Write an enzyme that holds these catalytic residues in place. Sequence first.
Site, PDB file in Angstrom:
ATOM      1  N   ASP A   1       0.867  -1.210   0.000  1.00  0.00           N
ATOM      2  CA  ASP A   1       0.000   0.000   0.000  1.00  0.00           C
ATOM      3  C   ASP A   1       0.896   1.251   0.000  1.00  0.00           C
ATOM      4  OD1 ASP A   1      -2.205   1.707   0.466  1.00  0.00           O
ATOM      5  OD2 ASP A   1      -2.990   0.532   2.178  1.00  0.00           O
TER       6      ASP A   1
ATOM      7  N   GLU B   1       0.336  -0.997  -5.197  1.00  0.00           N
ATOM      8  CA  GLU B   1      -0.867  -0.138  -5.059  1.00  0.00           C
ATOM      9  C   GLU B   1      -0.475   1.215  -5.668  1.00  0.00           C
ATOM     10  OE1 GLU B   1      -1.437   2.845  -2.405  1.00  0.00           O
ATOM     11  OE2 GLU B   1      -2.710   3.270  -4.164  1.00  0.00           O
TER      12      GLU B   1
ATOM     13  N   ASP C   1     -11.493  -0.669   0.508  1.00  0.00           N
ATOM     14  CA  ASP C   1     -11.662   0.808   0.615  1.00  0.00           C
ATOM     15  C   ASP C   1     -12.878   1.303  -0.202  1.00  0.00           C
ATOM     16  OD1 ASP C   1      -9.524   1.247   2.410  1.00  0.00           O
ATOM     17  OD2 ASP C   1      -8.066   1.459   0.788  1.00  0.00           O
TER      18      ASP C   1
HETATM   19  C1  LIG Z   1      -3.964   1.555   2.484  1.00  0.00           C
HETATM   20  O1  LIG Z   1      -3.385   2.187   3.654  1.00  0.00           O
HETATM   21  C2  LIG Z   1      -4.273   3.144   4.263  1.00  0.00           C
HETATM   22  C3  LIG Z   1      -3.620   3.955   5.385  1.00  0.00           C
HETATM   23  O2  LIG Z   1      -2.250   4.051   5.129  1.00  0.00           O
HETATM   24  C4  LIG Z   1      -5.493   2.447   4.765  1.00  0.00           C
HETATM   25  O3  LIG Z   1      -6.349   3.445   5.321  1.00  0.00           O
HETATM   26  C5  LIG Z   1      -7.179   2.982   6.356  1.00  0.00           C
HETATM   27  O4  LIG Z   1      -6.425   2.780   7.555  1.00  0.00           O
HETATM   28  C6  LIG Z   1      -5.735   3.931   8.135  1.00  0.00           C
HETATM   29  C7  LIG Z   1      -4.983   3.419   9.385  1.00  0.00           C
HETATM   30  C8  LIG Z   1      -6.852   4.910   8.471  1.00  0.00           C
HETATM   31  N1  LIG Z   1      -6.443   5.977   9.339  1.00  0.00           N
HETATM   32  C9  LIG Z   1      -6.841   5.897  10.778  1.00  0.00           C
HETATM   33  C10 LIG Z   1      -5.765   5.677  11.832  1.00  0.00           C
HETATM   34  C11 LIG Z   1      -5.260   6.684  12.581  1.00  0.00           C
HETATM   35  C12 LIG Z   1      -4.311   6.343  13.724  1.00  0.00           C
HETATM   36  O5  LIG Z   1      -2.961   6.204  13.269  1.00  0.00           O
HETATM   37  C13 LIG Z   1      -5.679   8.129  12.350  1.00  0.00           C
HETATM   38  O6  LIG Z   1      -4.581   9.001  12.105  1.00  0.00           O
HETATM   39  C14 LIG Z   1      -6.597   8.305  11.144  1.00  0.00           C
HETATM   40  O7  LIG Z   1      -7.180   9.615  11.232  1.00  0.00           O
HETATM   41  C15 LIG Z   1      -7.613   7.149  11.157  1.00  0.00           C
HETATM   42  O8  LIG Z   1      -8.742   7.255  10.266  1.00  0.00           O
HETATM   43  C16 LIG Z   1      -7.616   5.321   7.203  1.00  0.00           C
HETATM   44  O9  LIG Z   1      -8.773   6.065   7.595  1.00  0.00           O
HETATM   45  C17 LIG Z   1      -8.220   4.078   6.531  1.00  0.00           C
HETATM   46  O10 LIG Z   1      -8.775   4.417   5.260  1.00  0.00           O
HETATM   47  C18 LIG Z   1      -6.196   1.795   3.569  1.00  0.00           C
HETATM   48  O11 LIG Z   1      -7.358   1.108   4.002  1.00  0.00           O
HETATM   49  C19 LIG Z   1      -5.241   0.836   2.876  1.00  0.00           C
HETATM   50  O12 LIG Z   1      -5.859   0.243   1.735  1.00  0.00           O
END
Ligand SMILES: *[C@@H]1O[C@H](CO)[C@@H](O[C@H]2O[C@H](C)[C@@H](N[C@H]3C=C(CO)[C@@H](O)[C@H](O)[C@H]3O)[C@H](O)[C@H]2O)[C@H](O)[C@H]1O
Lengths: 515, 515
Positions: A312, A359, A412
């Site tokens: 990713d 990705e 996603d």
């Molecule tokens: C590819 O990688 C993405 C993130 O690098 C992933 O995104 C999902 O997971 C993330 C961890 C998430 N963020 C959350 C976690 C936190 C704590 O470290 C906060 O900073 C954020 O604000 C949180 O929402 C993303 O929201 C989420 O989409 C993808 O799924 C993956 O395919």
Amino acid sequence: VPAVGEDFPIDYADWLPKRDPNDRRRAGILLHPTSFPGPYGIGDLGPQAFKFLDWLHLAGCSLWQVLPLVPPGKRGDGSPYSGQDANCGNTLLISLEELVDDGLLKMEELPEPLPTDRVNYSTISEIKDPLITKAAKRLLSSEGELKDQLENFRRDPNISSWLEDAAYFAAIDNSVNTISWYDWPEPLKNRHLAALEEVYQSEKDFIDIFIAQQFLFQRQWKKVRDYARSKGISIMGDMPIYVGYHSADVWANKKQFLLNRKGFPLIVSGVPPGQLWGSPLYDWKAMEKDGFSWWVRRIQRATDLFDEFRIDHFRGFAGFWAVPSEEKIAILGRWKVGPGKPLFDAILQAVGKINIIAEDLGVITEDVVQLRKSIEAPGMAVLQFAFGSDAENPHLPHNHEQNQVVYTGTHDNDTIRGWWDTLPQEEKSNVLKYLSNIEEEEISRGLIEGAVSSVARIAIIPMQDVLGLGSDSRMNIPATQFGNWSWRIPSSTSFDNLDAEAKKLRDILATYGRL
Amino acid sequence: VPAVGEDFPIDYADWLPKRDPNDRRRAGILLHPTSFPGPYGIGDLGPQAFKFLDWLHLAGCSLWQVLPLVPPGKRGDGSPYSGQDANCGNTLLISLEELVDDGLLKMEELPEPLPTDRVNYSTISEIKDPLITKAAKRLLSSEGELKDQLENFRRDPNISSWLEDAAYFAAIDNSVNTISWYDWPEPLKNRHLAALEEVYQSEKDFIDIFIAQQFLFQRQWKKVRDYARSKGISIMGDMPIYVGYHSADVWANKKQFLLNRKGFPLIVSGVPPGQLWGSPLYDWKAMEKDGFSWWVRRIQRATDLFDEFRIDHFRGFAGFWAVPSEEKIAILGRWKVGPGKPLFDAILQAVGKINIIAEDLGVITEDVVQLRKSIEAPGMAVLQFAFGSDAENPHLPHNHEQNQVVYTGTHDNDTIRGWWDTLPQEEKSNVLKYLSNIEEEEISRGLIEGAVSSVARIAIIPMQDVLGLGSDSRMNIPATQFGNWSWRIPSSTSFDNLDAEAKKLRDILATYGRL
Ligand SMILES: *[C@@H]1O[C@H](CO)[C@@H](O[C@H]2O[C@H](C)[C@@H](N[C@H]3C=C(CO)[C@@H](O)[C@H](O)[C@H]3O)[C@H](O)[C@H]2O)[C@H](O)[C@H]1O
Ligand SMILES: *[C@@H]1O[C@H](CO)[C@@H](O[C@H]2O[C@H](C)[C@@H](N[C@H]3C=C(CO)[C@@H](O)[C@H](O)[C@H]3O)[C@H](O)[C@H]2O)[C@H](O)[C@H]1O
Ligand SMILES: [Ca+2]
Ligand SMILES: [Ca+2]
Ligand SMILES: [Mg+2]
Ligand SMILES: [Mg+2]
């Protein structure tokens, strides 16, 4: 061949063109094991894993895609992309039934069946953790084959290269209980050899139990992977490019990261307009100096779990956005030069040929395309992204290439039915026109067939689309904080009752050469 | 780029991936100019050529494919693949109306309108040849711009490199009138300089008229190509790998061919089980010694006529079947080593980048695939060949690649409707299943959309399929002796009445990114 003009052998015409087995057309299902049904609040590596792989084999699929298998961080949520460690397995995936089979748990200790619809990440640890701990303690006190296998696991040089650090980190985190190791007492923060010796003395049972739990994970995951292989199914995993600050990955390898003299990140990850992700960034200059040893070990562990895997934010190997750690939003950063192909040269030299999926979604630059083509890594096509611009949209099937992975949608994306439900009218008629004037009622079949009929050598369908599910079954809404990673196959749906779904997928796999 | 870890420029994100104009997706129509309608018994490079190119532009097509434009041999038939010469143009394609416009013919000399359905190759020469000769004689006696252009044409070193030999050969053939130059009087057979000087003295008017006719061809063909370019249309031609024995190509270049000391072929062309084609074979060993000069000149002339071209039996550059000339069938031959990539290196060095399409149909060996990929030449997919084996059939759309040309069918195939009419029931249901359960009544639309929606960067549709025609409009049945190359657009069909057909093609070109 002989000289120009001279005779070939009499058998020249038998020299037919060579089909390379790595070009084989394959289909797979995306299904994280947390989503398996069952009575213990979360899917596991137990009976349902084997039932799923039998269904996949019946469907003619030769690939299973999972999300990262790491333990999700609990500083909320269940996110596989916010792991406590890059190399450990999620102990919540350990099957309580397989531990009863091993004699490590008693039938009577199993909980009464729990609500089946959705994973409740706020309660599941409090239920399963004490039972996994009980099984680990029985293993540690046992004197048979499994005790011998535990000793061979913990002494394996590849395993011990991450597990000892992971176990000491977890023992100290449990004992000190600060938000981050940044605030640990100096002897533990800075890994004084005498302080670490004292940790083993005072936290011996914690460390031994942590290691035994990772062995129980390894053994169950290897049984699943061996069963998949027996059915001609490869397992595709996934890994974020970056790791979390509060982890053994950073604390035990501080000079691999861009930290200040106190261990605080100088710059953190994100994307410009924008998004502040906040991970520590790799010292790619220092990593090149030791032949990228940390990355080689991470890839060695990934190949221990998976036949092939996505990275990713693959674009970070070419160029990465770096935000000053004091900054509270993304706008004020700079693009930095990534390590490029020499990382992949080091991995090839150390670990041999790996099947990495890049990705490569969203706005990517020319250097990302050149880097991906330089290591012959496939990129992604996602059909749910194809129909909102013009005919040069790289997600449309007529723009696909052989060395590519096509999705209807990933974890996603909404489900096909959920995506269709909120699709603007102009984009719907575009979709229906492209897919050859098929009817709105058959949009799932149309998009699934659009993936399977692609030239892309791998096509992946989410299990939610095979089951015909709507937005209530979406695994993740990017950036949202609740309702994510909790979808499960409902209790009323069993793999044994899905023969019609398997046959319908098998028939299009046969037609489009993926069987 | 800067060093690993250092800042990129602030404008890094603007560096979007490069679309190479040679990867542009295009669509074309296959239509030999003999097939144009009109009142003079055969299509020509006159008013209907400009009407066709306006229709193509209206349809959004950016390619026009023609068969070889050489003069067909009359030792029967009208075959563009049995030419009298590799480099001359078919004078039967010369427009009598454009010569009236030039003042070289008088309205009154034009014949009364002839039957319009079909080319009658047994009568067309006897009607047009005397009129083209009259125009040539008027040009030769004229003193204006066209006389100056004729003098510049005949003195051009590229033109004179083939035209002088072609004109002397034709003068001697006319005078001596044997079946082959093998039986010419020794001074003409072996090109005694004094005998050739005498030929110019006794056959001066024949030679001058032959040259003027080739100028009239060149000038009309260049007007058509210039008009096509003004409308964004490239012209794709075609060339057999081998030339005919009874030609200036062999008689004036004997040491380029494998002949005996008397000029009789040692070995001739064909395919094993099989098919005896009977062309003389190239001395590829002797050709390498002079940098493939004969082949370079042939390619230079082909680029004078066409933007891009197919080579029929491209596999002969890797390996060729050689039959002893005494043998009366193919079985008793041997495969010989073809020149391979060094021919294409010489052509690149001498003529620069050319867009060659490799005809690679049927049983081909691994060395043919490697040679084609080594020069980045596209091969062919033909949808009418896709549905009679299994899902690994390379003609099925899911097996197409970007660097490929896809056809519904070529001039060697029946029309889509004719093919469907004689298709076995098992193969029909296979077709309908593959093309997503479309109805038998829409098979033309289904196959045309299957070509246009392919990843192949060029898609070509025969004009007979746009017009919805059956087996009565097939251009060629391979190996048959009659009814071939004679199809014309019927007199009742005019390009001005085909706006609906143009719009229907334009709409799918827009949907599948070929516009
Ligand atoms: C590819 O990688 C993405 C993130 O690098 C992933 O995104 C999902 O997971 C993330 C961890 C998430 N963020 C959350 C976690 C936190 C704590 O470290 C906060 O900073 C954020 O604000 C949180 O929402 C993303 O929201 C989420 O989409 C993808 O799924 C993956 O395919
Ligand atoms: C690719 O090239 C093919 C031949 O190389 C061409 O085939 C068509 O044209 C051939 C000339 C023809 N053969 C006839 C000519 C002869 C005189 O030299 C006889 O030997 C043969 O017996 C004749 O039939 C083929 O029949 C015909 O298919 C393809 O069309 C082209 O695509
Ligand atoms: Ca804590
Ligand atoms: Ca004659
Ligand atoms: Mg210290
Ligand atoms: Mg002599």
